[PDB]
């Protein structure tokens, strides 16, 4: 199940100021960027053009090139038409299709001031249940534009799935790539008196799915709290798993790492081991300004 998304970020400071930046993700790999400082959509991968020829790309780029300018002015006129709502204004757009055979569900979500309010469904734009009522009038206006509504329908029903099926094969090499995680141990005072928070750092692994647990032999320590996936510049991932122990309970515990790149043979970092000791000695510091 691969999810492809085009993310548009449009800001309006006033009547005379606006910028639009775009980014494009397949799974968790960035394929395209489009800065407000540039009249051309940029490839961030050697395979970002998909299975589309030069002529097919230039026509689609120009299609969007026309859209970026138009969108800006269309919004600015809607503001004047609602002049009820004032500047500054933030608009976000999320659009694309999910892959499953030939089946694919397409979407186009719109948020106004950081809250989801509009989506394109079937043949027209619609307001979300529990949305501002003043949004009806602009929606009524946007629907009277058959050409834009036809273009969107084309892009959602036909273009997205035919293009994304092209990318998935074009970048099969980078998607199936395997990167080995590296782990190192740490500890910090728990927020509770007499307690200690152990930390298992796990960095550099690709793809994303990973398993990290604290173990006493054959028993996974149920107090193991899995962290949030933090990105690295080389599109790999960092994650930490933490365990709260009473001072003294450190010994005999281990951090176990399961990742597809390791291929059976896990990483087992034991607390207090000669390796753990050697890693920690290479890490000492004056502790300013440690976290409160």
């Amino acid at each position, epitope marked *: 199940n691969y999810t492809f998304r085009c993310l548009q970020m449009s800001s309006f400071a006033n009547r005379s100021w606006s910028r639009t930046d775009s980014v494009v993700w397949l799974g968790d790999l960035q394929t395209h960027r489009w800065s407000n400082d540039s009249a051309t959509i940029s490839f961030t991968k050697p395979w970002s053009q998909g299975k589309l020829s030069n002529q097919q790309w230039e026509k689609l780029q120009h299609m969007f090139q*026309v859209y970026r*300018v*138009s969108f800006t*002015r*269309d919004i600015q*006129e*809607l503001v*004047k*038409m609602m*002049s009820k709502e004032d500047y500054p204004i933030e608009i976000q757009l999320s659009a694309g299709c999910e892959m499953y055979g030939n089946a694919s569900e397409s979407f186009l979500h719109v948020a106004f001031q950081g809250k989801y309010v509009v989506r394109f469904w079937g043949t027209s734009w619609q307001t979300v249940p529990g949305a501002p009522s003043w949004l009806d009038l602009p929606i009524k*206006v*946007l629907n*009277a*534009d*058959q*050409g*834009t509504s036809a273009t969107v329908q084309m892009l959602l029903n036909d273009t997205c799935p035919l293009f994304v099926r092209g990318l998935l094969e074009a970048g099969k090499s980078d998607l199936e790539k395997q990167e080995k995680p590296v782990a190192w141990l740490s500890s910090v005072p728990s927020s509770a008196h007499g307690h200690r928070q152990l930390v298992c750092h796990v960095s550099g692994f690709y793809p994303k799915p990973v398993w990290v647990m604290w173990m006493r032999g054959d028993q996974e320590q149920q107090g193991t709290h899995r962290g949030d996936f933090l990105p690295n510049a080389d599109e790999t991932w960092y994650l930490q798993a933490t365990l709260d122990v009473e001072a003294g309970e450190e010994a005999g515990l281990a951090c176990r790492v399961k990742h597809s790149s390791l291929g059976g043979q896990d990483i087992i970092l034991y607390w207090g081991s000669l390796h753990h000791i050697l890693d920690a000695q290479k890490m000492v510091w004056n502790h300013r300004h440690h976290h409160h």
Partner: T-cell receptor
Amino acid sequence: TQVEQSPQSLVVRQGENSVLQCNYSVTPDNHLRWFKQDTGKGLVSLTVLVDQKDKTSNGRYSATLDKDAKHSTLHITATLLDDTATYICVVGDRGSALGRLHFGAGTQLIVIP
Amino acid sequence: AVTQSPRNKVAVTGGKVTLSCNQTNNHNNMYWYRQDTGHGLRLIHYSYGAGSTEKGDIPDGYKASRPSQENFSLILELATPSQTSVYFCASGDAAEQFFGPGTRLTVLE
């Protein structure tokens, strides 16, 4: 100007054919309209063109549109005297209430009897 | 039908001139254009409905007012010889835009 027209003014012998040109750079180009302006009066619409390649007709007037050429031609078959007027080419950038019309200087058609 | 009043006007430099427009078409949008040789129609002010009023491409010298769906005025508080032109008033979603008969304004020193 985003919309130009040729010729400046045209002269035709009553009953013959008259050919008027329009060339633009309006982006995007949703539709193109031709107007007629009787001297001392407002603008009356003759015809509108929607498709990328559109061929429209109304009475003596017939018009063509090519969007990839950004060009249009208004034909008057068998001109009358009462056709002596300014003819203006107008392009609408967007097919919604948010659009904005771009006007040309127009051609001044003069029909000699 | 789009009604204009007056059809002709002679004003002096620094005088107050108001061109009144009207339409019984129940139209949301209205526009004020001026027509000068070798140009084609240029937009001065426009509106999306009662209360609202917006600057066009050449608003300098001109103000606008729309109190009702019917009326739309162009107000020249201090008149200039450079404001001598023919003025047209349009209405409709830019779907068909309908135009007025025009007002000849001459402003003299």
